[PDB]
Symmetry: C2
Subunit: 370 residues, 2 copies
């Protein structure tokens, strides 16, 4: 395999530089790295590698990876290759992958447009094989730069794997029978499509509203607020799937079921020993929905109520009421009001200033090992 | 089996009340629970069950489990049986166990006296089988009361299991050859004895110093400070093992190696996706010792320096100099100074107000699956 030969060369260079991350912006390091990439038998021949060589050799005066990103953003081929520094994807250093794109609904693509690339990884270097790395953002490159039109990659194969290994088992154990009928037994191609819909709607809605990101990113990085922002856009995508009639009805209901099942179940149990940001917001959704008539609990099993679409709209309306006051109060004041709302429906420990898994999901974590 | 019949009856009652935690202090609930306990053909006739039935039936006028705790604290037998409500042990509701005590070193128990019970669990109800439940504290009972002379149980069989599952393969992968010679191939009884020394010294030193807990507990619940307090007492215990000549030299060196291997390795990788309280403090220790000459990194491997005992003393001395200013500044000012000290040696994200696993241990988590 020619691709495996190229990837073995990247994996070996990755091993050599593993101890030198503090030098990743050092021009003496960058020159040696560029030189080794250039001299690599198979890898050095590739256009994207030549682009990275030029970006690295020029980094002292221009600390950007402009030629690499031009290649990637223009989709000159289906290869990604760069030097990465992403604190939440620690496995990434010098990495290479090849991807395949997925089909997309044309109305979805046109009406909810964003520079999102839902892709399957075909082959990759060691750092991309970590289950942690589910996406790739432009500021993950060492230059730390993101532009509004930079392509953003989501690795749908990893989300299909997660849905099969975790969500499917939580649906069987936690949901009333008939809860997610289109998802029941659906094949990987089907979940693939739903997941690709989810990420396209997800990225689009991050840019909508009164406190979009990245503009208000530094106000939305506290654990409960980062999760709440994730939830804001996924509830938005849920409602689009229910409300936009130009979307194919079968595919839209399937994407609805996927987003809801992921936020109600898989994201709800994330984090040990405390909930992570996604899980705090999902437990907020669970309790809000239970208290406002959107779901019901019958002997530890969740029933989705027929009124759930109206309750989801109410929940999204409530988030938007809080955020709209950015127009008349400080971002700090909106923050405090988003925290207050979150804390009404989650298990907040005021002395630890952190959250505990609400008892409903702590027991499922124990029962299912999730 | 008679104990098996008792615990089966406990587990069935635990199942019946599982959805009723909000009713655990309501007398109508308690009156019915007490009756079902009394009528359990085997459980109801245990003296400990008689005690609990009496406490519950009288909870309306005296909200405490005085008869149960008298039984337990007096070690009338080796059974524990109560109604629990411990937010960090969510699996505990109506629970039962039988334990066995362990050999005890006389000088250790006399010079470092505390009401600590290092025990092995022989049989237990379902809630005590959770890997989370490594200990039982007096305030974990529904009454939420703790007294200084109440017995505190540590389940040593669970620390042995954790040592063999995590620490051992971490020692093999991460430590330079000959780092922990007494622990190599140590049998379970040997680890058990080291672990019992550790918990006794652990509980003792919590009560010592200028900001002991429980007095200053509410200032030491923030994630970095909860970890730092655990670390303060374990480094104190390490140093006692090195410095107290009246302890048997073979057991003391073994306990030293055990406490260090646990704090340097197993505790340093806890928490997903972020480090938990133990792990932040262990990463503080790792980076402190690296920069101050106590350990050295060679080829990704930790070498313990011969100077390490003096660097551990310097580390504990530093913590104590910060805490000593409680005498001339507020508890809040000490808190900031403990946080500033922690953040100098850990990966703190000021916008998330939380920590990331430092890259050394993030890579180990990925590599070994810990
Ligand atoms: Fe997002
Ligand atoms: Fe402790």
């Amino acid at each position: 395999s020619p691709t495996a030969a190229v990837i073995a060369e990247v994996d070996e260079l990755r091993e050599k530089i593993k101890g030198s991350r503090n030098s990743f912006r050092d021009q003496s390091f960058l020159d040696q790295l560029a030189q080794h990439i250039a001299d690599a038998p198979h890898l050095g021949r590739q256009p994207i590698a030549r682009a990275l060589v030029e970006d690295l050799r020029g980094y002292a005066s221009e600390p950007r990876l402009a030629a690499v990103k031009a290649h990637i953003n223009e989709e000159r081929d289906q290869h990604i290759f760069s030097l990465f520094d992403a604190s939440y994807f620690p496995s990434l250093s010098l990495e290479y992958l090849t991807y395949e794109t997925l089909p997309t609904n044309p109305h979805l693509a046109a009406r909810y447009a964003s520079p999102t690339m839902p892709v399957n990884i075909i082959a990759s270097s060691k750092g991309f094989q970590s289950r942690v790395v589910v996406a790739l953002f432009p500021e993950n490159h060492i230059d730390g730069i993101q532009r509004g039109d930079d392509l953003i990659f989501y690795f749908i194969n990893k989300f299909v794997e997660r849905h099969n290994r975790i969500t499917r088992k939580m649906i069987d154990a936690v949901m009333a029978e008939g809860s997610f009928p289109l998802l029941r037994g659906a094949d990987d191609r089907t979940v693939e499509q739903a997941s690709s819909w989810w990420v396209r709607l997800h990225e689009y809605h991050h840019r909508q509203g009164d406190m979009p990101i990245p503009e208000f990113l530094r106000y939305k990085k506290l654990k409960p607020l980062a999760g709440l922002e994730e939830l804001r856009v996924d509830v938005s995508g849920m409602l689009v799937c229910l409300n936009d009639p130009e979307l194919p009805a079968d595919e839209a209901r399937l994407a609805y079921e996927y987003i809801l099942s992921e936020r109600l179940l898989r994201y709800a149990v994330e984090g040990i020993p405390r909930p992570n940001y996604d899980a705090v917001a999902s437990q907020l959704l669970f309790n809000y929905l239970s208290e406002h008539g959107g779901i019901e609990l019958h002997g530890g099993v969740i029933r989705l109520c027929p009124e759930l679409p109206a309750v989801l709209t109410e929940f999204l309306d409530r988030i938007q009421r809080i955020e709209q006051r950015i127009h008349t109060t400080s971002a700090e004041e909106v923050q405090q009001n988003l925290l207050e709302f979150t804390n009404r429906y989650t298990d907040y420990d005021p002395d630890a200033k952190d959250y505990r898994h609400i008892p409903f999901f702590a027991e499922i974590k124990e029962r299912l090992g999730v």
